[PDB]
């Protein structure tokens, strides 16, 4: 739990982070989908508990630089992410 892992639940393959889920879907319900129609909440076969699936941390990276004709130092901008988590 709580890391970027490649998971395989009943032949359903995926990659992401598995977290303890506070979702409360009824006992007969098995899977959980979202707006984009993909499974984000799952129930383990061995032990009937609820897990939330979250894609691993990703983002965009851009480079700030002056002209190479005058210097070659650069800076890095990570877009839309608190860099205490990079």
């Amino acid at each position: 739990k709580n890391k970027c892992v490649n998971f395989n639940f009943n032949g359903l393959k995926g990659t992401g982070v598995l977290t303890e889920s506070n979702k409360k879907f009824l006992p007969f319900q098995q899977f959980g989908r979202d707006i984009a129609d993909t499974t984000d909440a799952v129930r383990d076969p061995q032990t009937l508990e609820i897990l939330d699936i979250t894609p691993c941390s990703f983002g965009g990276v851009s480079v700030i630089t002056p002209g190479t004709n005058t210097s070659n130092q650069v800076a890095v901008l990570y877009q839309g992410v608190n860099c205490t988590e990079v």
Partner: peptide, 24 residues
Amino acid sequence: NKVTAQKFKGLTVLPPLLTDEMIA
């Protein structure tokens, strides 16, 4: 006041360069 969302698919919104306070 009179004028008024979690996409993991790869769609992002970039903030504008000019903040509202500078426009004001």
